[PDB]
Write a protein that binds this ligand. Structure first.
Ligand SMILES: NC(=O)c1ccc[n+]([C@@H]2O[C@H](COP(=O)([O-])OP(=O)(O)OC[C@H]3O[C@@H](n4cnc5c(N)ncnc54)[C@H](OP(=O)(O)O)[C@@H]3O)[C@@H](O)[C@H]2O)c1
Ligand SMILES: Nc1nc(=O)c2nc(CNc3ccc(C(=O)N[C@@H](CCC(=O)O)C(=O)O)cc3)cnc2[nH]1
Length: 159
């Protein structure tokens, strides 16, 4: 099964100038929990943003050009990226905006963190059709001394 995981600020903003304009340790811990020991597919810009491999995950990078780091796997299309995952129970697509748009139709599951932050952005999560999805998990957290925004972890399943 293909899943998308992403954290969205207001207006579905997910990035600005190739970075995520917030700092939420608890959301990065959620990302790690829900991705460790699964393949992760990302676009080249997200690869550059993260800046290093995510350990304990097969990292698959989409790029039209030859790869530039053999610590990760490089592929040139959506279907090649899926194939490179092999026979696994769940493939995690970890962005960015352009990659999320292409995997959305194939995805059966969304793991979305809805962060209460106002962020100028230049990259968005897709404007997906809400009627396609049923929320099956939802957990809101107030801001605290480590996490400067409130946020809500939600899992949605394709109806
Ligand atoms: N908040 C979150 O949850 C979250 C998650 C991930 C990323 N982000 C943010 O999102 C931003 C990056 O997103 P982005 O939309 O600019 O870029 P992206 O989706 O990460 O990367 C796009 C790149 O991937 C390659 N690619 C995409 N689809 C392909 C295909 N079908 N075949 C071959 N190559 C393909 C291309 O590389 P080539 O140009 O080499 O062909 C392309 O330029 C950054 O700000 C980042 O911090 C936020
Ligand atoms: N919910 C969610 N939050 C995100 O921050 C997020 N980030 C990406 C892309 N960018 C990043 C940036 C950093 C790390 C990262 O440093 N995570 C480490 C440590 C996690 C922790 O500190 O607890 C990891 O091992 O996953 C992951 C993805 C994709 N989907 C997301 N989805």
């Amino acid at each position: 099964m293909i899943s998308l995981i992403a954290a969205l600020a207001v207006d579905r903003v997910i990035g600005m100038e190739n970075a995520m304009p917030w700092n939420l340790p608890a959301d990065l811990a959620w990302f790690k929990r829900n991705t460790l020991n699964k393949p992760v597919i990302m676009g080249r810009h997200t690869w550059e943003s993260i800046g290093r491999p995510l350990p304990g995950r097969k990292n698959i990078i989409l790029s039209s050009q030859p790869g530039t780091d053999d610590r990760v796997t490089w592929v040139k299309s959506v279907d090649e990226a899926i194939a490179a995952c092999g026979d696994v129970p769940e493939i995690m697509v970890i962005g960015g905006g352009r990659v999320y748009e292409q995997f959305l139709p194939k995805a059966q599951k969304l793991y979305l963190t809805h962060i209460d932050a106002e962020v100028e952005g230049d990259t968005h999560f897709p404007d997906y059709e809400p009627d396609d999805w049923e929320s099956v998990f939802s957990e809101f957290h107030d801001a605290d001394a480590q996490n400067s925004h409130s946020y809500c972890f939600e899992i949605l399943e394709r109806r």
